[PDB]
């Protein structure tokens, strides 16, 4: 109940140093910046952390994030994803 700040929920779940570790891989695609990358490549990141998802299903993830069009993605929303997975629906 009350998920008008899912964003903050992500950082609260992980530690301080744990966050810095995720930053390392984010730079692989963003040389000088480490703030925002492409949405088409975002999913590729999801798999290169240690996952097992479908390419067609990644199409859906897009609509869930920026339902209103297709802009960009940041490190904040980026943590919101990894959180959704670890929980799992079952």
38 belongs to an annotated ligand binding site: no
Residue 87 belongs to what domain range?
Answer: 1-90
66 belongs to an annotated ligand binding site: yes
Query: How many other CB atoms sit within 10 Å of the CB of residue 52?
Result: 5
54 belongs to an annotated ligand binding site: no
Distance in angstroms (rounded) separating the CA atoms of residues 18 and 59: 28
70 belongs to an annotated ligand binding site: yes
* Burial classification of residue 18, based on how many CB atoms lie within 10 Å of its CB (0-12 exposed, 13-18 middle, 19 or more buried): exposed
Residue carrying structure tokens 């069009």: 69
What CATH number did the domain enclosing 21 receive?
1.10.238.10
Query: What is the rounded radius of gyration, in angstroms, for the C-alpha atoms of the chain?
Result: 13
Is residue 23 a contact partner of residue 34, using CB atoms and an 8 Å limit? yes
41 belongs to an annotated ligand binding site: yes
Query: For the chain, what is the domain count?
Result: 1
């Amino acid at each position: 109940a009350s998920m008008t700040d899912q964003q903050a929920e992500a950082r609260a779940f992980l530690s301080e140093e744990m966050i810095a570790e995720f930053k390392a891989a984010f730079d692989m695609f963003d040389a000088d910046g480490g703030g925002d990358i492409s949405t088409k490549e975002l999913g590729t990141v999801m798999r290169m952390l240690g996952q097992n998802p479908t390419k067609e299903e990644l199409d859906a993830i897009i609509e869930e994030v920026d339902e209103d069009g297709s802009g960009t993605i940041d490190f904040e929303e980026f943590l919101v994803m990894m959180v959704r997975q670890m929980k799992e629906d079952a």
